[PDB]
Design a protein around this ligand. Structure first.
Ligand SMILES: Cc1cc2nc3c(=O)[nH]c(=O)nc-3n(C[C@H](O)[C@H](O)[C@H](O)COP(=O)(O)O)c2cc1C
Ligand SMILES: Cc1cc2nc3c(=O)[nH]c(=O)nc-3n(C[C@H](O)[C@H](O)[C@H](O)COP(=O)(O)O)c2cc1C
Lengths: 194, 191
């Protein structure tokens, strides 16, 4: 509810990297049921209003959906190329799908769906991810879905950071700060050796 | 394997076609911690190890990832190339080569990596202990010939590779997998 102390740093990184579309791309690591890590790029879609949670979208049919359901803890690594800074953020994921697990967050899911472009919504109508490639281009050109009402395989994914490591390569010689949230939701920070 | 893996051409093309971006050689390495939680951080890609398909990186023995990898030497990299809009995910086992006696056959490779670094890259290995509370950052330059004990060469040997091209019809995705005979298969898959 109060802004986390690293929010200004993130805002300054986003602003100074705004010329690069890809500065909003970050890597989300999860753990598989078999204990091995998984890592893939997602698009950052802003913070959820009145919170410090980061928003992403994903398909319920993707592998990460089941990984997250079994172990919701993730760590993102986010590198900003124009300013040579990295944020690592670890915390719990919430996956809001069409199931009834998070009814209180359906409005957030619906809002996200509606805020997307047509192109972004259209991808949720593509064939089943990871299966043998459908060779006909038609399967990838479905009619747009309802732009008001999310499709059942659309998920809003939230990350609630409880630990953030910010590394600035343009320092004296480099600066590194660790932020941690305790059980009372209070943040602490400390400068640490790179 | 000693034969080039079938994804090596694709990596070569990506590296070439993104050569104007220094940061196209930065990638993110995910590991698992002893408590079961993931960890993810950027590293610099420093080429393939000669006569292999293994990727080279460097790291400090004092870093948290070093203990993580010693306990669970399976990692997944995610590598995004911004000008060609393509992603490689690569999973497999890591080898950490330090000054200890565990990989004597790879000491020559560790020494060569050290020698190939810039002076600036070597100097970091003389910095204070990573992660502890902050002239310490301007130590005498390390010997450029002989690696310091906290220098590690880190190798990743991929067993599975997922290559996604966002500039396709509409996107292309290929999965490559290595079997226990060290043979690679590939398959076009839905994005
Ligand atoms: C730049 C870029 C942006 C991406 N954005 C997303 C995204 O926001 N959500 C998503 O689920 N996948 C996104 N992907 C695709 C994922 O990286 C991955 O291929 C897909 O989600 C399947 O991952 P999974 O098998 O681990 O579930 C993006 C890929 C690239 C390279
Ligand atoms: C662009 C960039 C390149 C980096 N290159 C390396 C590197 O090659 N090796 C390394 O150990 N850390 C590298 N780092 C620092 C790591 O991201 C991380 O802060 C450090 O290794 C500590 O990680 P750990 O605490 O998980 O061990 C790099 C960071 C950035 C942003």
């Amino acid at each position: 509810m109060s802004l986390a102390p690293w929010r200004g740093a993130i805002a300054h990184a986003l602003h100074r990297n705004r010329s690069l579309v890809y500065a909003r791309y970050l890597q989300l690591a999860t753990v598989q049921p078999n204990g091995r890590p998984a890592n893939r790029t997602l698009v950052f879609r802003g913070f959820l209003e009145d919170t410090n949670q980061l928003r992403f979208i994903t398909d319920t049919r993707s592998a990460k959906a089941d990984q997250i359901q079994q172990q919701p803890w993730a760590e993102i690594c986010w590198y900003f190329p124009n300013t040579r800074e990295q944020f690592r953020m670890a915390g719990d994921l919430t996956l809001i799908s069409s199931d009834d697990s998070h009814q209180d967050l359906q409005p957030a899911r619906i809002a996200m769906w509606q805020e997307l472009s047509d192109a972004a919504r259209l991808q949720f109508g593509w064939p089943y991810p990871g299966k043998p490639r459908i060779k006909e281009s038609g399967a990838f050109e479905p009619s747009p879905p309802d732009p008001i009402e999310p499709v059942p395989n659309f998920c809003l994914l939230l990350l609630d950071p409880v630990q953030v490591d910010h590394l600035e390569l343009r320092g004296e010689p480099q600066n590194r700060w660790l932020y941690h949230r305790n059980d009372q939701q209070e943040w602490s920070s400390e400068a640490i050796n790179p």
